Design an enzyme around this catalytic site. Structure first.
Site, mmCIF file in Angstrom:
data_model
loop_
_atom_site.group_PDB
_atom_site.id
_atom_site.type_symbol
_atom_site.label_atom_id
_atom_site.label_comp_id
_atom_site.label_asym_id
_atom_site.label_seq_id
_atom_site.Cartn_x
_atom_site.Cartn_y
_atom_site.Cartn_z
ATOM 1 C CB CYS B 101 79.987 55.215 26.368
ATOM 2 S SG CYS B 101 78.833 54.043 25.985
ATOM 3 C CG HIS B 344 72.162 62.852 24.115
ATOM 4 N ND1 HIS B 344 73.287 63.632 24.543
ATOM 5 C CD2 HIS B 344 72.131 61.510 24.879
ATOM 6 C CE1 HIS B 344 74.066 62.337 24.610
ATOM 7 N NE2 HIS B 344 73.592 61.988 25.162
ATOM 8 C CB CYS B 376 76.574 60.324 32.628
ATOM 9 S SG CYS B 376 75.347 60.704 33.694
ATOM 10 N N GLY B 378 79.677 58.181 31.034
ATOM 11 C CA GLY B 378 79.479 56.629 31.147
ATOM 12 C C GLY B 378 78.206 56.959 31.962
#
Lengths: 396, 391
Positions: B101, B344, B376, B378
């Site tokens: 991620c 997103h 970020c 993750g």
């Protein structure tokens, strides 16, 4: 040289008080073929606790290296493992944020958090298993190939371009099985291995026989240069990588219990190891698979040391092509590397490799005594990266 | 601070951006890219970097793509198909970000790092997401659910309220509507020639998507107040104060300042510093709050020196936290809206925001000197990149 480098300096503050692993068993038809992933990690997490008489609620963080599991199954398996090892709700369980890696940064990021004062005690662990518990908390073969095929093909090119020969690669696999057989037969894995009490289903009858696995089942003591030179290439028609000179996915788990030096001391816990430094490096994309060859000099240098100061190495053997290259390129003494055998013999448990090698390194250093002062654990973080960790022998 | 660790890349004035583009972002839930394959989103953005610079494709030394939704090997094959269709040969290696991620900012950072290291002169940092598959929801959830559950927890601990989160979504839709209406996205957006199956009749009607279809200009505090909490009973996070998965692509062309100069190429931006940080585990999802100070400090700058911020709005809880913790001027952040409004597009966020930032810096004139893109990697990490306005 690297495109970038993450460096973690831990000084004297971050000690290892326990480091253990399950046996490793070949994923395709090994002795863990009827064992669920949480039943591999839980007993290794539990042994860290029992061996140090630690209250599980005192652990500030568990970070797990885990690759085969898709998506949300990564975290759920680890939480299942954590719960069953007796850790409460309040102990957060995290996974290594990589699509493909060998798990070493889990140990390094736990160490980094201790050095930063975020908590005092943490576990860096790893887990792989080809099996799936039907009971989930509250696919996998594709994932193995997705990591390992690119790694294999790149390394067969690096080897092909630097002239790492079929003989050299096969000799490495022979040495690995030789050294793993000799270490197994001498009982040198007994300290680090937590035996796993489980079941093995007889394919003929379906009956479940109770089994306790204590030994790495992938070792082939009869492996010779002659037996390996018969084996056919696995990637390309005239390639040098075979099933014999590369590693196969194995089921298993590893865990390392880290803490601040002063908390180990108030607790009366022997120091097994001192974590000195960690480096993660992004490599030139023109030559991938060579991770360790860049990360080892980086981590050794950050420790204020020279390559010659290192007494033992654990360098992952995902492929001999890449292992021999990294060894030769650095001019390392072959007699200081994977002294008890490597993944070519005992197997490649992807995300558990980091904690597995940490356990092997620290217990051999313990064994070899005071003059075995410095150790390096090194491996890839996928094709584009290397990781290397410097350890100093604990005083015990 | 404080970070558990930090990766810092220092680029000097050596690494310039000569082009940065994005597709429009369309809702994955039956938006206008619902009949467009992933490679058909990335290919025309990769092609636009080439066309706008008269560059030969084979001159590109590296293409690194942030891509999340795609499972395992499919990540790679989608990017390599997009590269093939953009006119790149086998000889141009395509890599993906090694993360389960991420929002893909490090793709840009690693290409810049490789250029600064002299490994090659020209590379592309890119990103791609699409819910469609060329003959993923589970992967999307795996990343965002824990992100939102954690960020809400942080909101509830540090006093980020439902009211302030909803206000941030209003603000996001308002700025994005103003931006769209004012022609501010025309420079960055590459329109996508595609086909669209009408849900009423089933007919394939060819279409050019030019606009971010998720902007909801009617978004008020009243309309957001009526939406139910998505995570727990008395939770602050809703489907309105968080971002929805979106299909799209972004790509950034980086090169050595001397090769751009030799080539007669206008410099859009100068990549100055990048930092990635591991954060305190006891407060996850606050990435940008640690990474912005770190990257800003690496550039030899202060927070006050930064003229524009692109901070990802994956959840308003997290976005408001980072803004408030750092005491940033709300008026310098996401000035053309954010992900709550335009979507997103997971791993495409890095390249997306870089393009938005640099184009707004260019448009604002010489006084808009410093920009920060932050997001970020993750729940456990934060990334931030510092850019300087191009001449």
């Amino acid at each position: 040289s690297a495109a970038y480098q993450r460096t973690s300096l831990y000084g004297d503050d971050v000690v290892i008080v326990a480091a253990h692993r399950t046996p490793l068993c070949k994923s395709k038809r090994g002795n863990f073929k009827d064992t669920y992933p949480d039943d591999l990690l839980a007993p290794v997490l539990r042994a860290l606790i029992e061996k140090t008489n630690l209250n599980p609620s005192e652990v500030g963080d568990i970070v797990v290296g885990t690759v085969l599991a898709p998506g949300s199954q990564r975290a759920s398996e680890c939480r299942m493992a954590a719960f069953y090892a007796g850790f409460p709700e309040t102990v957060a369980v995290r996974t290594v944020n990589r699509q493909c890696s060998s798990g070493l940064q889990a140990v390094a990021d736990v160490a980094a958090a201790i050095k930063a004062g975020f908590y005092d005690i943490g576990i860096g662990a790893g887990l792989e298993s080809m099996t799936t518990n039907p009971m989930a908390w509250e696919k996998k073969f594709a994932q193995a190939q997705n990591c390992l095929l690119p790694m294999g093909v790149t390394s067969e090119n690096v080897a092909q371009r630097f002239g790492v020969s079929r003989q050299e690669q096969d000799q490495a696999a022979v040495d690995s099985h030789r050294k793993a057989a000799a270490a197994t037969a001498a009982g040198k894995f007994k300290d680090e291995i937590i035996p796993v009490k489980t079941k093995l289903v007889d394919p003929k009858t379906g009956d479940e026989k109770p089994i306790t696995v204590s030994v790495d089942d992938g070792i082939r003591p009869t492996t010779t240069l002659a037996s390996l030179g018969k084996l056919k290439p696995v990637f390309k028609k005239d390639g040098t990588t075979t099933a014999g000179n590369s590693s196969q996915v194995s089921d298993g788990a590893g865990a390392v219990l880290l803490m601040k030096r002063s908390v180990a001391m108030q607790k009366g816990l022997p120091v097994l190891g001192v974590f000195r430094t960690f480096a993660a490096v992004g490599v030139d994309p023109a030559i991938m698979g060579i991770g360790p060859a860049v990360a080892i000099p980086a981590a050794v240098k950050a420790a204020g040391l020279e390559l010659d100061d290192i007494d033992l190495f654990e360098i992952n053997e995902a492929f001999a092509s890449q292992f021999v290259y990294c060894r030769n390129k650095l001019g390392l003494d072959p007699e200081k590397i994977n002294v008890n055998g490597g993944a070519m013999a005992i197997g490649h448990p992807l995300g558990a490799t980091g904690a597995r090698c940490v356990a092997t390194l620290l217990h051999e250093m313990k064994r070899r005594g005071k003059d075995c002062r410095f150790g390096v654990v090194s491996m890839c973080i996928g094709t584009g990266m290397g990781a290397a960790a410097v350890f100093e022998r604990g005083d015990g």
